[PDB]
Symmetry: C2
Subunit: 263 residues, 2 copies
């Protein structure tokens, strides 16, 4: 079998929710994760510098002998994904495309909403992808900048959190049939988000969608790992490993060890 | 967008159930189908000759400018699929792999059953695929040679048909958690088959699984067609177009025109 691990690059701890999905869906696959906290916000950097940074993360992943690379950073995805994908021989994917495509396939009336980070909403990457494939679908994007913090502080059910989501999503209530959770933190607020949007709205989790694609892409490329096996993942971060495993150990429902590294 | 059609090759009218799934899932995609009835049974031919035949079907499909080829014939798949796939630049898939992979991912206790045509069961292609990936899973294959005829004569609900399925599946009742419908005719007997196997057994429809993979493979290769569009498919057969559209018009719930051709 192909015992090489599937690598994940991200400018943060967010991509770990996709890793959770992966562990959930494909237990037997090895994982290598690189989070570049030290450099922080990618969004407000210059394109040239973001490609520099991304390639650094990609090259690090290559020297982990990964058989596939997954982009978890929307900024890295916006700026580099297509270039790196064209340059590499191994499969290279992001969560945006699958999120967009799922939203398209799932919209009832063509009223698609997408919430996310300020930078994500500022790049309007999701709308661009959606309409690039299905330009007749109406995309309404909304930034929800309180969501990440809430999530990262474990608190998804506080009465304050419930209020925050309630107020942050108001501009969309009653205006859309499907809402793309364009941030990897957001899967953790799903109950609340579904609740605030009503049983009428279809929630699209990009990370979960991405994982589904992985499954098909491992089969197509004949690079599946040992199904009877992973019990050996590797996590890396360029900054603050303490709080990394802190959040990681919570999300991954198990103690995981991080390795502070410097590219 | 990529307006080229998705081609389907098969030694019969069976692959049309996959086309139905495709129309159902991806309405906007053009289809080109080639059925080689004139040559009939592929299974009991020699490998060399089956590769000859397959390539003929593939070359015909290429001169329809297809952006993807789908193998519906288990015999053609067993013998050629990997060779053609290696030779072509466009994506080339079959229904077997997706069927196998789905069964694996879906088996509760590792007791997988697979029914199908005598030739399919004789090649043991499904078991070989399943155990090649997950060799610890127990595969029990069973030939159900009355199934095709029943289906092809429109009769899926006769009290005779119900008996036939009942008796044909007996050897598996109570012995498996998931059953792969290793024949493209069989989707049409699903109600009856599910009924005979009990609510306890998980039915895997290779064709439906295959279609799902297509969706992911169109996105990965950036060759999706116009989402707002197909209303223009093309069906070909090397023998007896009369009964082709006959069955086709039934399955596809619409009148479709076939073009008798000679490779």
């Amino acid at each position: 079998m192909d015992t090489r691990p599937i690598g994940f690059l991200d400018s943060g701890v967010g991509g770990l929710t996709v890793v959770c999905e992966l562990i959930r869906q494909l237990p037997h696959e090895k994982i290598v994760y690189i989070g570049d906290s030290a450099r922080a916000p990618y969004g407000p950097r210059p394109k040239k510098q973001i490609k520099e940074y991304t390639w650094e993360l990609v090259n690090f992943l290559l020297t982990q002998n990964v058989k596939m690379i997954v982009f978890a950073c929307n900024t890295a995805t916006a700026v580099a994904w297509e270039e790196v994908k064209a340059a590499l021989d191994i499969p290279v994917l992001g969560v945006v495309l699958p999120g967009a495509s799922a939203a398209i396939k799932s919209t009832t009336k063509g009223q698609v909403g997408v919430i996310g980070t300020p930078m994500t909403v500022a790049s309007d990457i999701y709308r661009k992808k959606i309409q690039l494939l299905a330009p007749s679908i109406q995309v309404r994007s909304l930034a929800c900048p309180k969501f990440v913090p809430i999530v990262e502080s474990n608190e998804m059910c506080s009465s304050i959190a419930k209020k925050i989501v309630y107020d942050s999503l108001a501009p969309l209530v009653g205006k859309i049939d499907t809402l793309v959770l364009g941030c990897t933190h957001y899967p953790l607020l799903r109950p609340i988000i579904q609740n605030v949007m009503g049983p009428s709205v279809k929630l699209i989790d990009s990370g979960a969608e991405c994982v589904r694609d992985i499954s098909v892409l491992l089969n197509y490329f004949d690079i599946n790992g040992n199904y009877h096996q992973a019990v050996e993942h590797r996590f890396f971060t360029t900054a603050n490993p303490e709080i990394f495993q802190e959040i990681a150990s919570i999300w991954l429902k198990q103690k995981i060890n991080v390795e502070h590294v410097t590219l």
